[PDB]
Design a protein around this ligand. Structure first.
Ligand SMILES: Cc1cc2nc3c(=O)[nH]c(=O)nc-3n(C[C@H](O)[C@H](O)[C@H](O)COP(=O)(O)O)c2cc1C
Length: 114
């Protein structure tokens, strides 16, 4: 499983954990991504309209699934089916965000443009 956990109580909602698979996919070592917002995976061909939907889902604390282009450390592109989910503690208070990444062009690109 490719996934990261971020802490929205810390400035700029930084990564506090990244799985081994996520590091292999993105070509980053854990030390150079901890404490950073996961936006470093976006690049020139990333649809900003899709990024806007992630921004709203984090604001409203809703789960969302989108497909978008991301970049590995060396600049290699990959399609990312991205599922974001809020994690709440026993008191029903927002505690973490978990983002799961599935690499592949699952939804055909010409259908996604609609
Ligand atoms: C847990 C978590 C995982 C995320 N994973 C990705 C990702 O894999 N790819 C991506 O493009 N954005 C991902 N994001 C979204 C960015 O981190 C960021 O929230 C988005 O770009 C909007 O924020 P910004 O406008 O300040 O950059 C993730 C966000 C969270 C909270």
């Amino acid at each position: 499983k490719n996934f990261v956990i971020s802490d929205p109580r810390l400035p700029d909602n930084p990564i506090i954990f990244a799985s081994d698979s996520f590091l292999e996919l993105t070509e980053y070592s854990r030390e150079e991504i901890l404490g950073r917002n996961c936006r470093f995976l976006q690049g020139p061909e990333t649809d900003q309209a899709t990024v806007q939907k992630i921004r709203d889902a984090i604001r409203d604390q809703r789960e969302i699934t989108v497909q978008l282009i991301n970049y590995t450390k060396s600049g290699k592109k990959f399609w990312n089916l991205f599922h974001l989910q809020p994690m709440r503690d026993q008191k029903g208070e927002l505690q973490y965000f978990i983002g799961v990444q599935l690499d592949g062009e699952f939804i055909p690109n010409p259908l996604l443009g609609l």
